[PDB]
Design a protein around this ligand. Structure first.
Ligand SMILES: CCCCC/C=C/C/C=C\C/C=C/C/C=C/CCCC(=O)O
Ligand SMILES: *c1ccc([N+](=O)[O-])cc1C(=O)Nc1ccccc1
Length: 255
């Protein structure tokens, strides 16, 4: 019955709003156009005055604030996961495993909400760091964000809104094919109901967008690739910057 899927869609949207303070709707109002105009960081001076207005090497300090924001995002995604019906009733090891692998695919999904072709909102939308300034950071740091922009440009052309994303990131978390899952079947039963929900949601919300559901699920492939590329550059950093510390919560996601 569609009524039950609409109720699930509504539940997850409500929890998403509660768990993610910077939504895509807010990010697009900030990026498009008086009380919400962000300060723009495009070089080192705008950076140093940006810290003054908004709020070690330049690249490492940017990398470490990015680290802190990721930890914060992990916390938010975790809070959202527990609202997905059935999630907290799963085996606790499977909960950990589903978060461990799901968290980065969700981070880059939602970070797309904060991006356009030219840069990324930061500091809850108070700031905007341009793509070019990031790419000009010294190796290996200038190559961190470029694949994320490349994904976001394609992903953002689907024109999903927050109510679509709430279901989609739930579908991501409840992925039966994560390595080491002790009991795959109850996870998959939840995901099918979420997939049903996502499907009805995309049909109702984007009636003229043919096979959006299929196109969205195929994006769940560019995501895995970005994760793989990402952990590769972190390992470069561990050996390059033996003075630089990774946050422990992020340490455990990457083991
Ligand atoms: C300034 C951190 C404030 C943390 C609370 C909320 C933050 C909103 C989201 C991100 C804020 C960015 C923090 C540090 C990142 C700077 C740019 C790194 C590249 C990127 O990340 O694309
Ligand atoms: C950038 C550099 C490093 C990490 N990491 O240490 O995992 C993460 C990121 C990143 O993509 N952070 C982030 C998360 C959410 C919003 C903006 C930036």
């Amino acid at each position: 019955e569609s009524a039950d899927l609409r109720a699930l869609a509504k539940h997850l949207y409500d929890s998403y709003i509660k768990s993610f303070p910077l939504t895509k709707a807010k990010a697009r109002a900030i990026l498009t156009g008086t009380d919400k105009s962000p300060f723009v960081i495009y070089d080192m001076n705008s950076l140093m005055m940006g810290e003054d207005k908004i709020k070690k090497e330049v690249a490492i300090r940017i990398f470490q604030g990015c680290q802190f924001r990721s930890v914060e995002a992990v916390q938010e995604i975790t809070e959202y996961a527990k609202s997905i019906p059935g999630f907290v009733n799963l085996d606790l090891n499977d909960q950990v495993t589903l978060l461990k692998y799901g968290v980065h695919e969700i981070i880059y999904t939602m970070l797309a909400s904060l991006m356009n072709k030219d840069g990324v909102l930061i500091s809850e939308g108070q700031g905007f760091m341009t793509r070019e300034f990031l790419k000009s950071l010294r190796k290996p740091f200038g190559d961190f964000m470029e694949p994320k922009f490349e994904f976001a440009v394609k992903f953002n052309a689907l024109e999903l809104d927050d109510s679509d994303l709430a279901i989609f990131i739930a579908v991501i978390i409840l992925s039966g094919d994560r390595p080491g899952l002790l009991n795959v079947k109850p996870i998959e039963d939840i995901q099918d109901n979420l997939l049903q929900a996502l499907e009805l949601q995309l049909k109702l919300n984007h009636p003229e967008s043919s096979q959006l559901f299929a196109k969205l699920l195929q994006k769940m492939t560019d995501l895995r690739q970005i994760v793989t590329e990402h952990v590769q550059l972190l390992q470069v950093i561990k050996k390059t910057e033996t003075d630089m510390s990774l946050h422990p919560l992020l340490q455990e996601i990457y083991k």
